[PDB]
Design a protein around this nucleic acid. Structure first.
Ligand code: NA
Ligand code: NA
Ligand code: NA
Lengths: 299, 256, 224, 235, 243, 210
RNA sequence: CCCCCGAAGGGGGUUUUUUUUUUUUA
């Protein structure tokens, strides 16, 4: 079973706290967690930390053959396989699970299908070769917000990643170690960022279905304790082009449309900050690398 | 139905094995149960059929087509069976699929020449079966639905091949029928009910085409509780019974 | 010469956790137990082990299955299993960085997996029979030298590769048993035993270092 | 003896051989070798004497293992014919709580506890072959022993060492620095569970936050400060 | 490229921006196969929905002492499209996402708590497909569940709205679903509250709200239709059963 | 595949009357086992069966034994999965007629037939292969100590496989799949002769061996 | 807690294809 046993006092406590405008970790309802993005070692290796939530992403690529249907496009896959490391409530590789399928689908719709990565820039030669870029997410610690953290990790990783320069002479290609030629980054078209809103019903279901004065509570980036007690969940992916990359309200507590719109806009307010943060941290990483090279060329 | 008590099984068997056999609904050994069929309801498909039985067993068949090189695809007719509540991996589903594929093999199941367009290209026929409900062996049900679907199947007309935009030619072919029989004691029964199939000593799958008893022919256990051996004269009885009571099923199905 | 980085109690929602880093090989491990096992895992008289190894790149394969197998071979006699009858210990290793050419070698990852698993088992509070330490060792093509803690480069030109996991007792001075020796490539008996002596010394060094690392962050948790 | 010493599994046990020693947690008597061997990493603890000294190893643990006379906080997760199914910790093996195991309880008069209720109980039976058993009464007399339902509070997950320190060590300042700010009810469960309830929700929340932050920090003297900053009611 | 929306305000099928496709429904179509059932046609979408239950759980696992278990099975037949799919869709992640979506939709609408220790199996067969299939699934489920006599708080109406440049188009077909981004809505009863909100392709934020506005309205109409059928089917089968 | 080493995906596969030997009880990790090898002119076959059971079953209490039959392709992937499962179903019917299932409530008997070798030098072979399957399964069931009301036998002629019990008086199996059109009686006679010979050989094997 | 008895006992929580570079410029 591996169920998380939640007591009545805890549910009532957290819900009543929400009624009195209180969150356990001391955040306001519209307050996203401080995102800590840390690069290391090779390009495409990134660690993302949201409060206690800890995820890790590893970008990699290898030469392959383009699919028969799509002759000019490269290959791109994302893996988000949970493990008992994040918590024992997770079974080892249940890809057919509700939240698993949902998470995977949200990330896929946010990054892989939105054209965030230039797939045609991955193609080496139309007929026989292409780049197979892979994004593998590793879930290290679960305190909620796995979708958002995953999206941030995948994007930051893709932007940080660099494939080795190559050139082509007909049948044959020539691939280079770092000493031969410098590596070149991937084609990032936009930066999709996900924000997850959690919905709580403070009153009874009757008030939600046939009651006026909507008391439905919404918070941003719920913790595990909050995620376990929520009645609804919405995930909205946006970019700095004011585009709704995707939206997923896969059932749950019925919410008024206007509230959902407000959620989308506030989410935009957050993804601005997050995007600027990602870009900044990236450039700082590159600069520190360059200065290290400068420290290496002369003792 | 299924999971009858030993008392019920004994009663039913005694009635079905007596001479003459007394069937639970008073049917004659060669009598079918009332069914009704609808066709041409799926516009996207080249053919379509729906068959409903009196016991609730319901099946849907779709006929689709695609141009193929004979040389690369020697099989011009493919049957895909999907039974609700049964995985595609299931033994009975693959058994029925194999069987149906053999009844309809372009080799001699049906006339392959009727499909030919050009010496290099032809129509491959995709027969998609969807068994919504079944309380007994659905092989005859499916077979009948497929018969109806094929007898009301229209294909694009030829004029690399190019085709007429609005006019279509009716696929002319004599589709085969598969019959299922219950062997109970010394009695042969056509269209076995679920309760009848629960106590049957054995079963006979008998194919039929152009007015002839054709292959495949199988012996099939309608259950696992009372599967017993049978004498050859019973097999002969079943064959004779089919070829005697098949042309009326054919004329009943082919009258539109 | 051989210096390692190691941390303890880094994960919140597990009983124990560790981070082990040697050269470029970086492995994080978690332990949950003793907890309730599912019926198919349950053992009447002893603790059952669920062991998982995840690769740095790609998705878990038969490679990681072999890694899990050897890790199990090491951790089974390590753990005092009869203290927890009909219970489960969940041990998961996430390889963050291989520090070696994944397609040809996996000894660095294995060694770091053993070290990290041991550390996490210590952090969890699970009864252990004794201490343990694992090192990777290579023998090079031309020099025919024995390199302890070989780099990926040294591995590329290696003639043989080796995983040495030893079991230690009495302050890390006595070798109780050899938990694992995984030797692959071309080698002879003399080379083997030289490799074993040097390997034992270096592993003892590692045991000492690990003891210090453990006490450094476990001692403040406890009361005088 | 009186001097506590750090110890690893496999290390040589340093107590007096001729002196009889009752063995607590951390120390294992091998069934085959009959050797006394440490199996836990931590601090070795030898009590003075009496009649025999206790040798035990205090080690950092997060996972509770039921032992008799322990005060635990469980949650009702199931109802049976003659007992409750109780959880002392998520993912752990459940514990049984007899229907008879209550004050003024008979077959006609049953306890009124539902699934999801907090129960404060005593581990009465912890056999290594059987499911653990808890109780909400004095097993001897059959009357109330300060056990029973915990209503409308907040529960706090905490490591075993912190909880044991909270229940047994009176020089521990957390309860004192909490009492300095508000009135509160507290139930301490050696299974790593702390129940807290104040009259006002705000104060209970403050208690929760400061207790958890105090749990994460090893330094004891910091507590007061933390409490201050936490009862200043920042967001 | 072609006139998806002509200056005259017409579409390829000849509809205007705010008009639903032909919507017809039938109830109790499979009385011998399920407790509740519905056959539904929306445009060219043809769907069979079967509700089995509430009934005894198959396993003595999957049994909940407090509420009923709700399962949804979506069968997208290989002949639903113009081109037959050689691959089954049953284990595709898209289909699993759809299934879990429908389940989590009707977990909050169906009073599962009054059917404890039971299982409600929903079996859906998409016979024909022509875009906007999600809303169709939703409607089919609502109809079939109501036919089963299974208690729920309200209707849930499913609809889709595409966004062509500045103008939104109601109830999109297959051709419109391509070369255009679409929003799927699951609206509760006559309320403004959304059970489902699905956006799978990029849409300008500033124009999203507008898309919802017509969508809700459309959904309301859909409700009025489903309702209109049920009552009739009720009125017919409550009068004939008399004497 | 995550559970197998299938190598590179870019790679593509390389394209370019009869004597009987019967033995039982040579496989040690199952209850019953049988080796059947057949040699006709320009045609040689050989297959093995293994009966694991009576074993426990997952699920509700069953009043009788539950038999499963699994055909495994040997060497060449010679046959279609659907046809293999069809033949499996056929054999299941036959040995549902033969095995004394009443003796084995809440119990499952799993039978595996490895089609190791099937090279006929002559230049739909399932039909000719079925009787040897039946022989091997009957032998392995008798070897496993699984109770049989009779010794299930079979014969093949003109694409017609017929499986008999009780000295050929009654039929437990009938398989007819194209293989030309001839009258039923002589196919019955030939298959019955094959059946009787196979029966004699099987009892003989069960008397020299068990 | 429901179930009998009478005035306490026994049982139960349900393991898609619409067809000449660059710059400023009336
Ligand atoms: Na509605
Ligand atoms: Na309208
Ligand atoms: Na059985």
């Amino acid at each position: 079973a591996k169920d998380i046993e939640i007591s009545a006092s805890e549910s009532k406590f957290i819900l009543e706290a929400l009624r009195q405008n209180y969150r356990l970790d001391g955040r306001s309802f519209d307050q996203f967690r401080d995102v800590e993005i840390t690069f290391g070692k090779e390009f495409g290796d990134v660690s993302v930390k949201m409060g206690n939530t800890k995820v890790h992403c590893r970008i990699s690529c290898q030469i392959a053959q383009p699919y028969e249907d799509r002759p000019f496009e490269g290959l791109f896959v994302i893996s988000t396989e949970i493990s008992p490391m994040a918590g024992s409530q997770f079974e080892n590789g249940n890809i057919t699970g509700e939240d698993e399928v949902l998470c995977s689908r949200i990330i896929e719709k946010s990054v892989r299908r939105s054209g965030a990565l230039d797939v045609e820039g991955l193609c080496i030669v139309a007929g026989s070769k292409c780049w197979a870029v892979r994004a593998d997410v590793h879930f290290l610690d679960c305190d909620g917000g796995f979708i958002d953290a995953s999206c941030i990790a995948v994007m930051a990783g893709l932007m940080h990643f660099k494939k080795p320069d190559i050139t082509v002479h007909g049948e044959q290609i020539i691939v280079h170690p770092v000493n031969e030629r410098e590596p070149v980054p991937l084609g990032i078209l936009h930066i999709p960022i996900c924000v997850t809103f959690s919905f709580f019903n403070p009153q009874d279901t009757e008030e939600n279905i046939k009651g006026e004065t909507n008391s439905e509570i919404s918070i941003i980036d719920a913790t595990l304790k909050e995620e376990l007690l929520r009645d609804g969940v919405l995930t909205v992916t946006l970019n700095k082009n004011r585009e709704v990359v995707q939206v997923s309200k896969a059932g749950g507590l019925p919410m008024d449309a206007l509230t959902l719109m407000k959620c989308c806009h506030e989410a935009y307010s957050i993804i601005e900050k997050i995007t600027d943060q990602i870009l900044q941290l990236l450039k700082e990483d590159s600069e520190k690398r360059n200065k290290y090279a400068a420290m290496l060329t002369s003792e | 139905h299924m999971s009858l008590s030993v008392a019920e099984k004994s009663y039913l068997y005694d009635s079905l094995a007596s001479t003459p056999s007394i069937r639970p609904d008073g049917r004659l050994p060669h009598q079918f149960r009332p069914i009704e069929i609808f066709t041409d309801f799926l516009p996207s498909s080249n053919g379509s059929s729906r068959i409903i039985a009196s016991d609730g067993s319901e099946c849907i068949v779709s006929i689709k087509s695609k141009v193929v090189d004979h040389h690369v695809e020697n099989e011009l007719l493919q049957v895909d069976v999907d039974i609700a509540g049964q995985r595609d991996d299931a033994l009975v589903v693959e058994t029925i699929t194999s069987l149906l594929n053999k009844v309809l093999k372009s080799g001699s199941g049906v006339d392959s020449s009727k499909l030919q367009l050009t010496k290099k290209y032809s129509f491959k026929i995709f027969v998609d079966v969807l068994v919504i409900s079944s309380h007994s062996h659905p092989i005859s049900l499916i077979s009948f639905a497929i018969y109806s679907a094929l007898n009301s199947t229209y294909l694009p007309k030829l004029i690399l091949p190019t085709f007429h935009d609005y006019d279509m030619v009716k696929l002319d072919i004599n589709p085969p029928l598969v019959f299922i029989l219950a062997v109970v004691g010394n009695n042969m029964l056509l269209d076995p009910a679920a309760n009848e199939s629960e106590v049957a000593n054995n079963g006979l799958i008998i194919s039929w085409s152009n007015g002839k008893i054709t292959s495949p022919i199988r012996s099939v256990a309608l259950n696992d509780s009372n599967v017993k051996s049978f004498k050859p004269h019973l097999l002969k009885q079943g064959l004779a019974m089919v070829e005697k009571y098949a042309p009326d099923v054919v004329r009943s199905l082919e009258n539109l | 010469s051989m210096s390692v980085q190691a941390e303890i109690g880094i994960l919140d929602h597990v009983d124990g956790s560790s981070e082990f880093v040697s050269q470029d090989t970086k492995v994080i491990c978690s332990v949950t137990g003793p907890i309730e096992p599912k019926a198919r895992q349950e053992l009447p008289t002893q603790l059952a082990l669920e062991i998982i190894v995840r690769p740095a790149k790609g998705v878990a394969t038969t490679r990681e299955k072999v890694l899990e197998d050897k890790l199990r071979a090491v951790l089974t006699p390590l753990i005092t299993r009869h203290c927890y009858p009909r219970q489960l210990c969940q041990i998961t290793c996430q390889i963050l960085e291989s520090g070696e050419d994944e397609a040809e070698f996996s000894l660095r990852e294995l060694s770091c997996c053993i070290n990290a698993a041991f550390l996490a088992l210590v952090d969890a509070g699970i009864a252990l029979n004794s201490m343990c330490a694992s090192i990777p060792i290579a023998i090079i093509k031309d020099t025919s030298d024995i390199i302890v803690d070989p780099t990926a480069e040294q591995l590329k030109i290696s003639l043989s590769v080796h995983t040495l996991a030893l079991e230690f007792v009495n302050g890390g001075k006595v070798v109780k048993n050899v938990l694992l020796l995984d030797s692959n490539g071309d080698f002879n008996e003399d080379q083997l035993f030289s490799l074993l002596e040097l390997g034992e010394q270096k592993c003892q060094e590692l045991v000492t270092n690990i003891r210090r690392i453990i006490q450094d962050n476990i001692s403040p948790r406890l009361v005088v | 003896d009186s001097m506590s010493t750090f110890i690893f599994p496999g290390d040589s046990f340093p107590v007096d051989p001729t002196t009889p020693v009752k063995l607590g947690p951390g120390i294992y008597c091998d069934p085959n070798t009959q050797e006394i061997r440490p199996v836990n990493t931590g601090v070795l603890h030898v009590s003075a004497k009496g009649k025999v000294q206790t040798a035990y190893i205090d080690y950092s643990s997060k996972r509770y293992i039921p032992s008799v006379n322990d005060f635990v906080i469980g949650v009702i997760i199931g109802t049976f014919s003659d007992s409750y199914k109780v959880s002392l910790q998520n993912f752990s093996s459940s514990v049984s709580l007899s229907y008879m195991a209550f004050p003024n309880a008979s077959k006609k008069n049953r306890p009124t506890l539902q699934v999801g209720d907090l129960v404060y109980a005593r581990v009465c039976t912890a056999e290594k072959e059987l499911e653990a058993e808890i109780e909400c009464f004095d097993s001897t007399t059959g009357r109330d022993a300060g056990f029973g339902i915990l209503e409308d509070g907040m529960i706090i997950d905490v490591n075993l060492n912190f909880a044991r320190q909270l229940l047994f060590n009176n020089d521990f300042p957390l309860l004192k620095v909490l009492a300095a700010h508000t009135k509160f009810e507290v139930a301490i469960g050696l299974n790593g569970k702390i129940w807290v309830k104040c009259e006002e929700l705000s104060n209970t929340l403050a208690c929760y936050r400061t207790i958890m932050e105090c749990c994460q920090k090893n330094d004891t003297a910091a507590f007061k400060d933390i409490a201050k900053r936490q009862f200043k009611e920042i967001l | 490229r072609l006139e998806i929306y002509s200056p005259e305000g017409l579409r390829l099928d000849g509809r205007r921006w705010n008009e639903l496709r032909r919507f017809e429904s039938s109830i109790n179509t499979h009385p011998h196969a399920a407790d509740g059932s519905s056959y539904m046609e929306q445009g060219n979408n043809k769907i069979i929905t079967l509700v089995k239950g509430p009934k005894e759980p198959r396993l003595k696992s999957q049994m909940d002492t407090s509420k009923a278990l709700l399962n949804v099975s979506v069968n997208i037949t290989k002949f639903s499209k113009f081109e037959r799919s050689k691959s089954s869709h049953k284990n595709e992640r898209r289909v699993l996402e759809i299934q879990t979506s429908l389940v989590r939709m009707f977990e909050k609408n169906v009073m599962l708590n009054i059917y404890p220790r039971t299982v409600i199996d929903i079996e859906i067969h998409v016979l024909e497909q022509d875009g906007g299939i999600m809303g169709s699934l939703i409607n089919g489920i609502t109809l079939a569940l109501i036919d089963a006599g299974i208690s729920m708080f309200d209707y849930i109406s499913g609809i889709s709205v595409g966004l062509y440049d500045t103008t939104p188009l109601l109830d999109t077909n297959s051709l419109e679903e391509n070369a255009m981004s679409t929003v799927t809505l699951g609206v509760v009863g006559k309320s403004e509250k959304l059970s489902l909100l699905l956006v799978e392709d990029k849409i300008p934020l500033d124009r999203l709200e507008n898309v919802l506005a017509i969508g809700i309205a459309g959904a309301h109409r859909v409700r009025d239709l489903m309702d209109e059928e049920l009552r009739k089917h009720a009125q017919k089968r409550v009068s004939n059963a008399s004497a | 595949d995550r559970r197998r080493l299938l190598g590179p995906a870019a790679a593509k596969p390389m394209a370019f009357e009869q004597e009987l030997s019967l033995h039982t009880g040579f496989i040690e990790n199952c209850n019953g086992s049988a080796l059947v090898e057949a040699r006709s002119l320009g045609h040689q076959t050989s297959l093995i069966t293994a009966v694991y059971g009576p074993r426990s079953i997952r699920g509700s209490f069953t009043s009788q034994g539950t038999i499963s039959i699994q055909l495994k392709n040997g060497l060449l992937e010679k046959y279609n999965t659907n046809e293999l499962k069809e033949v499996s179903s056929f054999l299941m019917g036959i040995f549902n007629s033969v095995v004394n299932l009443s003796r084995y409530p809440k119990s499952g008997i799993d039978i595996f037939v490895y089609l190791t070798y099937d090279k006929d030098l002559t230049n739909s072979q399932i039909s000719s292969l079925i009787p040897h399957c039946i022989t091997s399964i009957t032998l392995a069931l008798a070897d496993a100590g699984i109770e049989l009301v009779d010794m299930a036998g079979a014969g093949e002629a003109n694409g017609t496989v017929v499986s008999f019990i009780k000295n050929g008086e009654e039929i437990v199996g009938f398989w007819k799949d194209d293989g030309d059109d001839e009258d039923l009686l002589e196919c019955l006679d030939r298959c019955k002769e094959q059946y009787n010979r196979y029966r004699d050989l099987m009892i003989s094997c069960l008397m020299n061996q068990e």
